[PDB]
Ligand binder design. Structure first.
Ligand SMILES: *[C@@H]1O[C@H](CO)[C@@H](O[C@@H]2O[C@H](CO)[C@@H](O)[C@H](O)[C@H]2NC(C)=O)[C@H](O)[C@H]1NC(C)=O
Ligand SMILES: *[C@@H]1O[C@H](CO)[C@@H](O[C@@H]2O[C@H](CO)[C@@H](O)[C@H](O)[C@H]2NC(C)=O)[C@H](O)[C@H]1NC(C)=O
Ligand SMILES: *[C@@H]1O[C@H](CO)[C@@H](O[C@@H]2O[C@H](CO)[C@@H](O)[C@H](O)[C@H]2NC(C)=O)[C@H](O)[C@H]1NC(C)=O
Ligand SMILES: *[C@@H]1O[C@H](CO)[C@@H](O[C@@H]2O[C@H](CO)[C@@H](O)[C@H](O)[C@H]2NC(C)=O)[C@H](O)[C@H]1NC(C)=O
Ligand SMILES: *[C@@H]1O[C@H](CO)[C@@H](O[C@@H]2O[C@H](CO)[C@@H](O)[C@H](O)[C@H]2NC(C)=O)[C@H](O)[C@H]1NC(C)=O
Ligand SMILES: *[C@@H]1O[C@H](CO)[C@@H](O)[C@H](O)[C@H]1NC(C)=O
Ligand SMILES: *[C@@H]1O[C@H](CO)[C@@H](O)[C@H](O)[C@H]1NC(C)=O
Ligand SMILES: *[C@@H]1O[C@H](CO)[C@@H](O)[C@H](O)[C@H]1NC(C)=O
Ligand SMILES: *[C@@H]1O[C@H](CO)[C@@H](O)[C@H](O)[C@H]1NC(C)=O
Ligand SMILES: *[C@@H]1O[C@H](CO)[C@@H](O)[C@H](O)[C@H]1NC(C)=O
Ligand SMILES: *[C@@H]1O[C@H](CO)[C@@H](O)[C@H](O)[C@H]1NC(C)=O
Ligand SMILES: *[C@@H]1O[C@H](CO)[C@@H](O)[C@H](O)[C@H]1NC(C)=O
Lengths: 408, 135, 184, 49, 146, 49, 37, 98
């Protein structure tokens, strides 16, 4: 089943490894919005034997990391699944824990369900085709029992893939007595880091379907109630102001984008705001779309003619060509010359195809190797002051390549 | 239609309720208009439809007008100050009370002369020095 | 607004600015101090009186004419003719009135916060303390305003500078005419 | 030069209570005030000269 | 009752509190200004020297030093203004001490409100507080005069 | 930001932003002195009143 | 004092005022004696 | 401009001029505060002239120490210098009062 809940104030980790005490340092990073929407999920496989099929597995989006929180008895949940497009068309992740082990792969895994047969492997992937990376060692989660189920363990996991170095920000809080996401505040610390490099926009997890229990069935949806005992949250980039305790932990924190009171507490570095008016920021109407109005031209102005020529003029008599109304793509010219030197000036060639010019001028000639760099705005010598000079305010750029094969 | 944003709040240990003031903008145009990923301040959870008063310094969100005028606590501008008022606690924005309205009994022959006085001690706190420092 | 004035709606420029340290929160605090100091300046200069006085319904001051300095109900701003003369003489540029061309072109985070005491309560302060100083003399500068007739208050001011009351009470018409001509 | 963090000053045995993961101390200056020895795993204090 | 007023008031020594807190805040901002990249790779000199090499380390340190010097410059620039305002307030206090304390003042509403009798200054941290003793005519009665 | 590439657009933006920041700092430094002068004049006006 | 104030190992020192707050009190008491005797 | 070439001389000159401009800005920032202080002192001097010189001042310790009698100003280089004339009760004797 699926149900909604209110995040309250949770999902706060230490942004850095560094220690603080009685400081109110603020930071910008991925975090959980306070009092945000959190989605419960439950997988019913108890009746799988008597046919009827589980039929309960959505494809959870992963966009900008995921927050994880749940309560499993010993190992009811095992691992998670990343990737995109499912099929071998693109890669996928296979993070899963084993007793006191963890195995990570980025192989192109094609599958249909999430049944990690055990209470083994397989059933959740069918292609070890072109695996690129693997990893092992100590698992993330350590189980602790209070000799009874009253101390419901809560495993808060912060999951991110920002330029690799995948984060295991986690903590154990078995202080729960039954209430879902109890009021309070705890922090999260990292365990390991590792880079892979992969476009993840899909999330799935692994449950123990071979022996499951307490999975009631109903049609709860669209902001309804239902017991799932498995929470998932998504992160968005925010600014947070954190209260570091005297001991060094995090006692409490406030958002900087949720409520104007919190915005005040963030813009003036204090948890307490007295009576008065304060200035925080502005408000700007965001653009709905982007309009382009480049002139409706299609005739590609001749650049092959000027570049790939056979009678390039001398430096003392340079060959000047005017460019008129045309849409010029400055990306098909890379195969027109060896391009020994393609340095460019205040206009950079990279996003040169998104600009409009009054008029474009090209001048082609030949010079010696020791003077290939002599042509620049304000250079002096023989050619640079006698045959061709560039003005100091010149905008544009020069193209150079060796013609020793032909002009020999 | 950008502009400054000001938060009007009483002391944090008096309430957690604030009234937002937008600087120099009429609400009927932009600050009422709000959507996800449309205005840079994402604290826009405020209704923009309740307790919407219009002030020459830009209109105010979160407090309702009161005809009554008192010595004003949180200055706003254009003779407007909002303050916390017990209804049962909400932020109210009113026009400044200039002071106790008083009259005099001027006549071409009447005079007023005191018969008993009152010695009162006041305090004027004048700084004379600041923390000397060297860099 | 530092961000608006420096990096107009450019995320990259804003990011490059953020590293500059708290060099603009301080800049905001400086100008906030300036603005609150302006409001305190006006409040301290004008709000010397705890209570607002009104002139008596009748206007006779032993020949003294205060028509040019006392506010008139005829004009819609409740100001003195002289005060209106000064308002006309001074060409104010901006006042922050939700204008929504020189002021308009300031789409650059440069805003002008309107003064706390608008020029209809400053006029009320001025009129109140004028009523105080022309019906009670100095006594309203110390305690409760003491109703004292104006020719007698005038003779008392003359006593202040060693001229004695007899000069005033023997020249009252002359002093009234000179005062009225000067005020005009 | 503790773990690449430099600085010049006297080091005393500190009474701070760095959590198992926190390494370099701080104050409200964005400047280090205490450090944990990476080898001895004990919490020193930093006080410049 | 003036002692009780000062004790039970929320904040009466607002001017001295602001004078102390302004320097505290300026000092803290100045010190916090050390940790800013100012458009340099890092804000730590030992690292920016060891990792880098003098060719571009010179220009990186130049950028950091000009940023740091400008930040220090703004501190003293506002310090001169603050000390000039404090000089004006101290000159005002000196005249008040020279008059209100060492004699009666015929200046109305200078040494407290009302007609002035005397004053007693008291030392304060980074300032002085005056105890103006003033005569207020209090209750009155109307009469008929000529 | 439409013409350059980030590598050097960063330094171009940094030069422009430091120029703009110096210009803004000049304005506020002048404003503080103007406010000091206005406060002196307003205190004189308060005494005069 | 060689934590906020102790942190200033950055050439930022505060100098004690010339008149410590035990001779300023003597000044105040002396001129009080003058103004009441 | 005799050694370098415009390409890099532009940035070198730019660094030099921004340094020199910062130095000049500092001078006039200090000048503004100095002139504000001098303006306050000159307002004090003008009030002192109009009060002490043009009449007696009942303000204690304003025009010199002691009860004030008059004041004769004297021109000074970039300043004014007053000669306050003051009445000091000098030697005294105790008495019995009721
Ligand atoms: C947990 O499961 C993994 C596979 O999901 C298994 O990994 C084996 O680990 C042992 C440890 O020495 C290796 O010898 C085997 O070659 C691994 N098998 C495979 C298929 O990689 C194993 O069952 C568990 N992992 C451990 C014990 O580290
Ligand atoms: C993924 O693995 C498959 C395994 O068959 C690769 O498929 C063939 O790989 C050989 C390698 O010599 C190529 O010559 C064939 O053309 C491939 N067949 C295809 C693509 O249909 C495949 O190349 C691997 N892909 C990657 C990206 O490593
Ligand atoms: C990760 O891969 C998915 C594959 O679908 C990308 O989704 C597509 O992105 C393109 C480019 O913007 C658009 O056509 C659509 O947004 C998606 N296509 C379809 C058919 O849905 C996704 O953008 C990739 N992520 C990143 C960061 O590039
Ligand atoms: C210049 O233009 C000519 C067309 O006039 C092209 O010549 C081609 O050169 C490639 C590489 O040597 C050959 O494979 C083609 O067969 C040539 N085609 C023709 C029609 O000549 C080419 O674009 C340029 N040639 C050179 C030498 O730069
Ligand atoms: C300069 O421009 C081009 C570049 O070498 C030379 O070639 C001719 O340019 C004209 C345009 O001006 C084209 O219409 C012709 O098709 C180009 N080719 C020929 C064979 O004429 C042009 O001759 C040069 N002019 C000079 C050097 O005076
Ligand atoms: C959460 O989502 C439900 C339905 O999607 C919606 O009714 C509810 O208002 C949302 N709550 C929050 C806090 O976003
Ligand atoms: C904080 O530190 C003190 C002293 O080091 C200790 O007594 C206290 O238990 C600590 N608090 C914790 C560990 O939560
Ligand atoms: C805030 O107010 C509450 C009750 O009004 C009081 O208990 C608390 O001590 C106050 N805190 C501060 C810092 O003034
Ligand atoms: C305020 O005054 C007018 C009419 O007197 C009107 O807006 C309203 O009735 C009044 N409001 C209250 C609360 O009295
Ligand atoms: C006061 O003035 C009014 C109006 O001129 C006059 O009628 C009245 O007699 C005057 N009273 C005295 C005592 O002069
Ligand atoms: C905005 O509303 C105020 C108050 O009604 C009005 O004075 C102002 O003119 C309005 N804005 C414009 C641009 O008319
Ligand atoms: C570090 O190593 C030394 C010897 O190499 C050893 O005695 C010590 O126990 C180790 N751990 C710590 C925390 O010092």
């Amino acid at each position: 089943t699926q149900s909604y809940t209110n995040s309250f104030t949770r999902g706060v980790y230490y942004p850095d490894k560094v220690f603080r005490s009685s400081v109110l340092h603020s930071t910008q990073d991925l975090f959980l919005p306070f009092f945000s929407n959190v989605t419960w999920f439950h997988a019913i496989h108890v009746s799988g034997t008597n046919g009827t099929k589980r039929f309960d597995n959505p494809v959870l989006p992963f966009n900008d990391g995921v927050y994880f929180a749940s309560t499993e008895k010993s190992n009811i949940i095992r691992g998670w699944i990343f990737g995109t497009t499912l099929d071998s068309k693109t890669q996928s992740l296979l993070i899963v824990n084993n007793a006191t082990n963890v195995v990570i792969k980025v192989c192109e895994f094609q599958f249909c369900n999430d049944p990690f047969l055990d209470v083994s492997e397989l059933r959740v992937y069918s292609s070890a085709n072109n695996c690129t990376f693997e990893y092992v060692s100590q698992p993330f989660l350590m189980d602790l029992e209070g000799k009874q189920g009253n101390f419901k363990n809560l495993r808060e996991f912060v999951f991110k893939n920002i330029d690799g170095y995948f984060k295991i920000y986690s903590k154990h809080t078995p202080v729960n007595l039954g209430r879902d996401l109890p009021q309070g505040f705890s922090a999260l610390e990292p365990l390991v880091d590792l880079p892979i490099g992969i476009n993840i926009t899909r999330f799935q997890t692994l449950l123990a379907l071979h022996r499951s229990y307490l999975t009631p069935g109903d049609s709860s949806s669209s902001w309804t109630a239902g017991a799932a005992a498995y929470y998932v949250g998504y992160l968005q980039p925010r600014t947070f102001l954190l209260k570091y305790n005297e001991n060094g932990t995090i006692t409490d924190a406030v958002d900087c984008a949720l409520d104007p009171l919190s915005e005040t507490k963030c813009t003036l570095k204090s948890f307490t705001v007295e009576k008065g008016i304060y200035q925080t920021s502005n408000f700007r109407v965001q653009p709905t779309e982007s309009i382009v109005r480049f002139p409706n031209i299609t005739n590609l102005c001749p650049f092959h003619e000027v570049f790939n020529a056979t009678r390039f003029a001398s430096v003392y008599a340079w060959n000047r060509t005017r460019i008129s109304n045309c849409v010029a793509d400055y990306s098909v010219l890379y195969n027109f010359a060896p391009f020994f030197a393609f340095k460019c000036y205040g206009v950079s060639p990279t996003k040169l195809n998104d600009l409009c010019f009054t008029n474009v001028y090209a001048d082609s000639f030949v010079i010696r190797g020791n003077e290939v760099s002599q042509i620049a705005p304000g250079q002096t010598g023989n050619i640079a002051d006698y045959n061709y000079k560039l003005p100091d305010d010149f905008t544009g750029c020069v193209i150079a390549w060796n013609s020793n094969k032909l002009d020999s | 239609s950008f502009g400054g944003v000001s938060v009007i709040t009483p002391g944090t240990n008096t309430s957690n309720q604030v009234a937002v003031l937008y600087q120099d903008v009429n609400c009927t145009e932009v600050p009422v208009a709000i959507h996800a990923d449309q205005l840079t301040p994402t604290w826009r959870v405020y209704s923009t439809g309740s307790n919407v008063f219009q002030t020459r310094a830009g209109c105010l969100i979160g407090a309702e007008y009161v005809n009554n005028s008192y010595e004003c606590d949180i200055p706003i501008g254009a003779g407007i100050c909002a303050s916390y008022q017990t209804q049962s606690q909400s932020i109210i924005a009113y026009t400044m009370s200039l002071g106790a309205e008083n009259s005099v009994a001027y006549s071409n022959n009447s005079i007023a002369i005191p018969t008993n006085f009152t010695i009162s001690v006041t305090t004027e706190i004048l700084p004379v020095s600041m923390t000397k420092t060297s860099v | 607004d530092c961000t608006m004035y420096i990096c107009g709606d450019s995320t990259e420029c804003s990011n490059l600015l953020l590293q500059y340290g708290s060099f603009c929160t301080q800049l905001k605090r400086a100008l906030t101090g300036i603005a609150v100091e302006q409001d305190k300046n006006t409040q301290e200069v004008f709000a010397q009186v705890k209570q607002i006085y009104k002139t008596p319904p009748i206007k006779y001051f032993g020949g003294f004419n205060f028509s040019q300095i006392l506010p008139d109900p005829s004009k819609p701003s409740k100001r003195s003719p002289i005060e209106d003369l000064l308002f006309n003489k001074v060409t104010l540029a901006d006042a922050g009135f939700i204008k929504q061309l020189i002021c308009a072109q300031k789409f650059n985070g440069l805003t002008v916060l309107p003064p706390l005491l608008t020029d209809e309560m400053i006029a009320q302060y001025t009129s109140a303390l004028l009523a105080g100083t022309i019906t009670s003399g100095w006594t309203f500068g110390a305690g409760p305003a003491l109703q004292i007739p104006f020719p007698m208050q005038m003779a008392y001011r003359f006593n202040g500078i060693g001229v004695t009351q007899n000069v005033l009470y023997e020249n009252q018409k002359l002093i009234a005419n000179q005062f009225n001509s000067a005020i005009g | 030069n503790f773990n690449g963090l430099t600085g010049t000053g006297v080091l005393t045995e500190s009474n701070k209570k760095f959590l198992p993961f926190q390494q370099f101390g701080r104050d409200i200056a964005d400047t280090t005030d205490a450090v944990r020895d990476p080898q001895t795993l004990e919490i020193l204090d930093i006080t410049p000269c | 009752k003036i002692q009780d007023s000062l004790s039970s008031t929320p904040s009466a020594l607002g001017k001295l509190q602001d004078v102390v807190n302004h320097n505290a805040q300026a000092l803290n901002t100045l010190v916090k200004q050390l940790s800013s990249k100012f458009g340099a790779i890092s804000s730590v000199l030992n690292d920016i020297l060891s990792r880098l090499d003098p060719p571009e380390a010179e220009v990186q340190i130049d950028r950091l030093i000009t940023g740091r010097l400008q930040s220090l410059q703004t501190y003293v620039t506002q310090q001169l203004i603050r000390a000039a305002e404090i000089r004006a307030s101290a000159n005002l206090a000196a005249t008040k001490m020279s008059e209100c304390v060492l004699g009666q003042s015929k200046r109305v509403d200078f040494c407290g409100k009302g007609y002035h009798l005397m004053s007693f200054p008291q030392s304060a941290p980074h300032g002085v507080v005056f105890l103006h003793v003033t005569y207020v005519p209090a209750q009155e009665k109307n009469f008929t005069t000529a």
